[PDB]
């Protein structure tokens, strides 16, 4: 996350931190995700498409820090990793960039909700937030495009939804954005998602309820003039989600 603030998992209790174990045992951070039911985390397919072996993945819930522990955190294996069959990408845009991870504890259980571990409500295709709405993005991604390392602590910021009509202009993203994607950015282009934030939640408040509106997917850069963050539009994948969960 470029700009914004550090946060704690109490402020985003659906946030899932996804890591991968390598051959020799070293574990690296992959991507964010969101808990949508006790057994299911939703994320982005591009996070896993090069390494789709489920056994290598580690999912944490209730975790506020990258390499230190948070009391009440819970660790999971991935029982099923489901990538979208029609995922595609060019050198910039990701299409159908959505993935499901069925999570399972060492003890064979799904998540137990707590103060720091909670599901987030799925959106409805009838209840879109209007352009100009402010939404929250969260993740462990780079604080600058030029940073080699990720931050040691979760961050969050606020961005505003941008209309499809506007995002499709040649000087924004033209034909690279579709109606299955949402654009969002800072009006002054100083806060944004970045590398490492993929798979994480774009959350908007609808009728007072925190709702999973987007999944961090791609951008030309991070906090870059006329180049918004682009998010998978969750309300346009409800059948896919229900079929697989």
């Amino acid at each position: 996350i470029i700009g914004g603030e550090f946060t704690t998992i109490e402020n985003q209790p659906w946030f899932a931190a996804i890591y991968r174990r390598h051959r020799g045992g070293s574990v690296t951070y992959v991507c964010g995700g969101s808990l949508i039911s006790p057994c299911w985390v939703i994320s982005a397919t591009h996070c896993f498409i090069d390494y789709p072996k489920k056994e290598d993945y580690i999912v944490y819930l209730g975790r506020s820090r990258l390499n230190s522990n948070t009391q009440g955190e819970m660790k999971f294996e991935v029982e099923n990793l489901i990538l979208h069959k029609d995922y595609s990408a060019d050198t910039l845009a990701h299409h159908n960039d959505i993935a499901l991870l069925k999570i399972r504890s060492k003890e064979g259980r799904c998540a137990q909700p707590s103060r720091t571990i909670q599901t987030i409500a799925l959106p409805s295709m009838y209840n879109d937030p209007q352009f100009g709405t402010s939404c929250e993005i969260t993740g462990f991604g780079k604080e600058q495009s030029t940073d080699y390392l990720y931050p040691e602590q979760l961050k969050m910021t606020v961005v505003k939804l941008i209309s499809h009509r506007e995002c499709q202009q040649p000087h924004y993203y033209g034909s690279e954005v579709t109606t299955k994607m949402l654009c969002a950015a800072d009006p002054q282009w100083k806060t944004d998602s970045c590398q490492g934030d993929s798979g994480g939640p774009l959350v908007c408040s609808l009728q007072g309820r925190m709702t999973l509106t987007g999944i961090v997917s791609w951008g030309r850069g991070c906090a870059l003039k006329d180049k918004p963050g682009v998010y998978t539009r969750v309300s346009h994948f409800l059948p896919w989600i229900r079929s697989h969960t």
């Binding site: 030029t146 970045c194 934030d197």
Partner: peptide, 13 residues
């Protein structure tokens, strides 16, 4: 490598 990213790689500082 860095063929799959959120956004095209930027040289590190």
């Amino acid at each position: 490598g860095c063929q799959v990213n959120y956004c095209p790689p930027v040289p590190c500082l």
